[PDB]
Ligand binder design. Structure first.
Ligand SMILES: Nc1ncnc2c1ncn2[C@@H]1O[C@H](COP(=O)(O)OP(=O)(O)OP(O)(O)=S)[C@@H](O)[C@H]1O
Ligand SMILES: Nc1ncnc2c1ncn2[C@@H]1O[C@H](COP(=O)(O)OP(=O)(O)O)[C@@H](O)[C@H]1O
Lengths: 8, 340, 192, 340, 192
């Protein structure tokens, strides 16, 4: 549904 | 099919793109030239002729496709990839496009294989829980272009029978405004700038404008954007469209029956009042339109922004048989003169 | 010693010297006597700014008691060659050669501080040797004096005859008199 | 079933100017598929795989060798690019996508995708920067992939299941161009020079071919470039393209059956019109190609731009049986001659 | 002090001195007196540019009152040996040796500023010792004078007899006269 993709 | 006649009809509905019309007439004619009597040549692997349109916003891409469908005898489709979800998800699937093509051809396989395909907003599928409208759409479309027979249930399925309609014979027109495609081309063409006396120094913008920048594009430049090289390999043809011309803006408001001037004219004719637009006001509008960098679509802003006071005050006003718009009106310093 | 400053940018923090920070904003400093080394450094700065932007005005602050003539003429020809308008400002003092580069700026973009002072005189020289050699060096310095007066009249607008009489000996010009003399355009008293 | 001599001729038909590269890929692919037919029924078990690593200039036909091979071999092929690749979990990409791409050819492969081939482009872009998600880190992830493993892959995207597919059997061909590698090997093997007086200057930029130096390339030189020796150990086979030649470009348009010159010739055969391409016109295309530093890839732009006027007017024109092209026409100062 | 500049590149930001930035664009500066150290530094710059690109023109800006002859001849032989065309420009002044390196540039790529000045004279020397040693050093400097006049005629196109008469004493040449004399090709008044 919702993708929480984050990279430091 | 005549390249000289197809260009004459498109000239009626489209203006400002002379080079692009020549490209479409050649590619379109080469597409049908192969289907009717082609693939009977001494040399094998005749390259499939395709089209890849590229232009800014309001460049008339939709109009060119539409004008072709009306002129052309076979059917035409307008299938964007904004909602094309792969693997049969809730949004949509690529198979429906094949289905919609048959509806236009009335389940005629012999007539549907000779059809044309056009897609808008192809930049949105550029590769970046899961991704549904990303690079996945390229994979499904890739099979459609390279060539493959698919299975479509006739009438949606009452048996499990499908129609094995070919796809290598159908033409495809991938076109959409590519945002940011100018900085990438700028790096290659600029090749730095000299600092000494003899070396020439570039100004703020001499060759960095959208016009004369896409013609020198290459396939490797699109790879950095996000597209797949195999997808671009199947479309060796490219069509570069100029942003706009000052003279074309004056013609778009006078020759087309759907011009904005004629629209507002009928809006006031029902009220029992006449309207007029002098030539000095038309050319002034074109200078302000190009500054907005939006195209013909952003032309209504300049018109209604000027006729706001003219339309708001109008109903209360009486004995105003005709209204004249002077060049000063576009500037906004002087109000339009009223005729009693 | 030169103080170091930090220019806050989106990419990150960068450390710059006070002179290099102003160079980024198209500002060059002319300090001390005009010589071959100091003059050749300013020329490289002007060319660097030309490539970065040929449509932005350059500002040249001059505080110098003058110096060699040949070193100064290299700067004058550069300002006229490049397209950008080289704005000139006089801070503290502007001697014979400093005044020639001051008036050589773009018309309408020349300023002088309220308490600045300009001084103009004739070229200085000398030679020791045979009489035949003295005549050669004398004819050369005479051409420069005539050439320097011709260009001074071109930018100041005065006549060549007036410049010859005023440059026979040292002549100091206050900031108000320079405007009336055509050397500058206005005075930057306060920031409005 | 095929042999190295038979495949050499087929490769020669579509590729030229690369003789050593043909023998390398022929024996490599020949012995690779021999291992699949025999499997491990012989005394020897767990027959090791031999990978291939190509190094050559840009546009030197590296991709064509892999594409033409897939047509004759008939096995599935994919063209992956390593520029987007990122180090295990970053915004750009993950290595998992590559595995599905190969299956995407047929979308259903259990004992059929193991025998497929994969190509990689721009391998030098991931060189270990020594000043990381772009550098060395990426190489570490590919080690286990090339050595052979199994990755879960949803077939067709959908079951509540995933299919396991081996990758030891799957051969990999890492293609790429290593610019500046001549300086590293020159100081090591031939001579330390280029900057001194007695030292040889780089006068032979185009007079002589750098290729000959690349033939003496070794894995030790690749370590200084930035690659990991462990990564190069998995790819013992090495292929080195020498250069592209002006006369070769003339042969590229005449010797290959799929040459662009022959496609237009076949296009007009059904139309009942003859086509011609003189030798004086092809040499000019070679100069324009090298001028843009693109190779054979930037060839269609020169041809299609020149024949746009002729093709557009050919249907309109009548009683024309032959077309002649001259060198002046390529420059754009002349119009091609027409014979009735 | 030398100002620092930032060269925006795709890889990242880098800090360079004003002299090093121009070196990246095949530009070398010849400032001050010509000596063994300053001359040996410019030679290394030319070779570095040759390796980077042997087909791009090099630009040499000269602002110098001259100096040692042997130091200058090392530069002249280098310009002729390398394949690239060494373009020369005169800024401020060009003395005896500065003029020889100016005219030694590639034909058709020699320029002089509108207010630049060139000066040419004969070699200078001297010796103290026995009469036998004075005769040796006198014959050597005479060969150099003859050799320097022969090469001057080759690039300027004039006759050897004319160079001998014109180089007997100091001779100043304005920018227009240098073009008429074959020393240069044109003048870079404005940027077109
Ligand atoms: N070439 C053209 N000639 C005449 N009118 C045009 C032309 N292009 C655009 N217009 C006008 O602008 C309107 C919108 O044009 P569109 O073709 O829809 O713009 P567009 O750039 O194709 O939109 P996108 O970017 O594909 S969503 C048309 O209904 C016309 O009124
Ligand atoms: N021998 C050849 N014959 C015909 N075309 C060639 C040949 N060599 C290269 N090409 C052309 O080069 C293109 C492929 O270039 P490619 O090998 O992908 O470049 P790179 O080596 O940088 O990957 C193809 O479009 C093909 O037409």
């Amino acid at each position: 549904x919702x993708x929480x993709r984050x990279x430091x | 099919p005549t390249p000289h006649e197809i260009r004459n009809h498109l000239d009626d509905y489209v203006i400002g793109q002379e080079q692009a019309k020549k490209v479409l007439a050649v590619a379109v004619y080469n597409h049908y030239k192969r289907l009717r009597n082609g693939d009977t040549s001494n040399g094998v692997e005749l390259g499939k002729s395709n089209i890849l349109l590229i232009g800014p916003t309001g460049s008339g891409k939709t109009l060119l496709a539409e004008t072709l469908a009306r002129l052309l005898d076979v059917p035409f489709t307008m299938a964007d990839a904004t909602t094309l979800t792969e693997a049969g998800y809730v949004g949509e699937d690529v198979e429906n496009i094949i289905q919609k093509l048959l509806q236009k051809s009335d389940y005629d396989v012999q007539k549907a294989q000779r059809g044309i395909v056009y897609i808008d907003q192809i930049d949105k599928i550029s590769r970046k829980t899961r991704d549904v409208s990303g690079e996945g759409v390229q994979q499904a479309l890739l099979k459609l272009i390279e060539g493959t027979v698919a299975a479509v249930p006739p009438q949606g399925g009452r048996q499990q029978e499908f129609l094995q309609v070919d796809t290598s014979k159908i033409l495809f027109i991938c076109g959409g405004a590519f945002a940011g495609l100018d900085k990438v081309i700028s790096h290659r063409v600029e090749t730095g700038s000299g600092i000494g006396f003899g070396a020439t120094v570039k100004a703020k913008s001499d060759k960095a404008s959208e016009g004369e920048l896409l013609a020198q594009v290459e396939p490797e430049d699109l790879i950095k954007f996000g597209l797949i090289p195999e997808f671009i390999g199947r479309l060796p043809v490219v069509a570069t469209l100029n942003e706009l011309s000052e003279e074309a803006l004056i013609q778009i408001l006078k020759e087309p029956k759907n011009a904005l001037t004629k629209q507002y004219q009928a809006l006031f004719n029902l009220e029992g009042v006449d309207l007029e637009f002098r030539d000095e006001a038309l050319d002034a509008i074109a200078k302000k339109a190009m500054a907005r960098k939006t195209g013909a679509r952003g032309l209504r802003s300049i018109v209604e922004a000027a006729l706001l006071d003219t339309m708001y005050d109008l109903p209360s006003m009486e004995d105003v048989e005709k209204v004249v718009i002077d060049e000063s009106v576009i500037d906004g310093q002087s109000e339009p003169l009223l005729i009693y | 010693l030169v103080p170091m400053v930090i220019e806050q940018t989106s990419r990150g923090e960068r450390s710059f010297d006070i002179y290099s920070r102003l160079l980024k904003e198209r500002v060059i400093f002319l300090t001390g006597q005009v010589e071959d080394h100091m003059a050749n450094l300013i020329v490289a700065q002007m060319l660097f700014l030309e490539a970065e932007n040929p449509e932005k005005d350059i500002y040249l602050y001059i505080n110098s008691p003058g110096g060699v003539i040949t070193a100064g003429m290299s700067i004058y020809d550069t300002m006229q060659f490049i397209k950008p308008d080289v704005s000139t400002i006089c801070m503290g003092q502007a001697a014979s050669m400093g005044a020639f580069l001051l008036t050589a700026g773009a018309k309408g973009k020349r300023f002088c501080l309220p308490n600045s002072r300009v001084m103009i005189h004739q070229p200085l020289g000398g030679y020791q040797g045979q009489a035949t050699d003295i005549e050669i060096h004398a004819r050369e310095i005479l051409k420069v004096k005539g050439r320097m007066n011709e260009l001074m009249a071109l930018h100041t607008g005065q006549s060549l005859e007036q410049i010859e009489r005023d440059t026979e000996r040292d002549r100091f010009l206050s900031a108000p008199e320079a405007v009336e003399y055509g050397l500058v355009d206005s005075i930057l008293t306060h920031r409005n």
